[PDB]
Structure formats: structure tokens, C-alpha cells
Design a binder for this molecule. Structure first.
Ligand code: NA
Length: 187
């Protein structure tokens, strides 16, 4: 003699998850109290899903998504079920971002004193990565460098002190990536 019952308040709602593509995502749910003890299943944008695919696993209170792809993003809902009815959790957004990569890596230059040189860096990612430039792991000297819109690093009248390793850094909220290239000067 226990009450046939289903509450409306989840013991644990799933919470939003932010991931870089390739990383795993884990959503957690505990259903409301009830009798009989509710089970759970999961919906993605109101459509019920299953653990058919190898990279998806549903067990306990967890939905586990290995090797996230941009497709995986959406609103995930946990549903608590028993013979009284179904209850929908507050939804959790899965965001899948893309760690920055290089469309165009900068390439070693070799140049004779007093004469133009340019270095190129084109990046991709989601969000769009912030591009930074360095020299010998320190800030670009003043006066010298001309800057196009695209992250092209330009010089009109090169000189010997300009010698060293020039690094392009691409950075968003989900990763960082470095690519450097030598500038060689000759009298
Ligand atoms: Na599976």
C-alpha cells in the first residue's frame, strides 16, 4: 500500500554543456519522485533518442555523447516516466564549438636588407578565432609592422634586427593553436 504518484519537480535537471567538437558530452538527470519509481529517457529537440550508435550511451541518469559533432547541438530534455505519466525536465542546451585551425600557415621568408616582406595567417573556428602575432615569444617591436585587414604582417624596409621566429596565434573560447615561421635577413 504505497500511493500511485508522480511529482513535477526533477530531483536533478540536466544543465547546459559546452564542448569542442571531438570532446565527449555528458548530461545528467534524476527524475521527480513517484511510485512506482520513474524511469527516464531522453529527447533531442523534442524527438526521443536511443543508444543505437556506438558513440551514444544511455545508462543510469546519464546520457553520454562521445565524439561530439556540430549536429549533436540542440536542446536536450530528460523525461521521467511511470504508470501515472510522463514529466519533462527543464532542457539543457548542448553547444558544439570548433577549436581553431589554420587555413593558411605563415611560411619561412628569406629577404635581403631594405626591401618588403609579408607574412600570412588565415584561421578557422567557431567562434571565429582571435589572431595574435609574436616575435621570439615576445611582442612585435614598434614602428616596423604594417597590418592589413586579414591578419597579414607587412614590412616596407626590412633590417637585420628584424631577424627571428614570428608566431601566429589563433584563439577562441575552446582552444588555441600556434604556427611560427623564420625571417632571415642578408647583407
Ligand atoms: Na551505443
Amino acid at each position: 500500500l504505497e500511493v500511485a504518484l508522480l511529482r513535477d519537480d526533477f530531483r536533478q535537471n540536466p544543465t547546459d554543456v559546452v564542448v569542442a567538437a571531438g570532446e565527449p558530452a555528458i548530461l545528467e538527470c534524476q527524475p521527480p519522485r513517484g511510485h512506482p519509481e520513474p524511469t527516464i529517457y531522453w529527447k533531442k529537440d523534442k524527438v526521443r533518442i536511443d543508444d543505437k550508435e556506438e558513440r551514444i550511451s544511455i545508462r543510469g541518469g546519464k546520457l553520454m555523447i562521445s565524439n561530439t559533432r556540430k549536429s549533436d547541438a540542440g536542446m536536450y530534455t530528460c523525461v521521467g516516466t511511470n504508470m501515472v505519466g510522463e514529466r519533462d525536465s527543464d532542457p539543457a542546451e548542448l553547444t558544439v564549438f570548433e577549436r581553431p585551425t589554420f587555413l593558411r600557415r605563415p611560411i619561412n621568408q628569406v629577404v635581403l636588407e631594405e626591401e618588403a616582406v609579408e607574412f600570412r595567417c588565415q584561421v578557422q573556428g567557431d567562434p571565429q578565432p582571435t589572431v595574435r602575432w609574436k616575435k621570439d615569444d615576445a611582442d612585435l617591436p614598434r614602428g616596423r609592422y604594417d597590418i592589413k585587414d586579414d591578419y597579414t604582417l607587412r614590412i616596407k624596409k626590412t633590417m637585420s634586427t628584424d631577424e627571428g621566429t614570428y608566431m601566429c596565434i589563433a584563439e577562441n573560447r575552446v582552444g588555441k593553436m600556434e604556427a611560427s615561421a623564420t625571417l632571415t635577413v642578408r647583407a
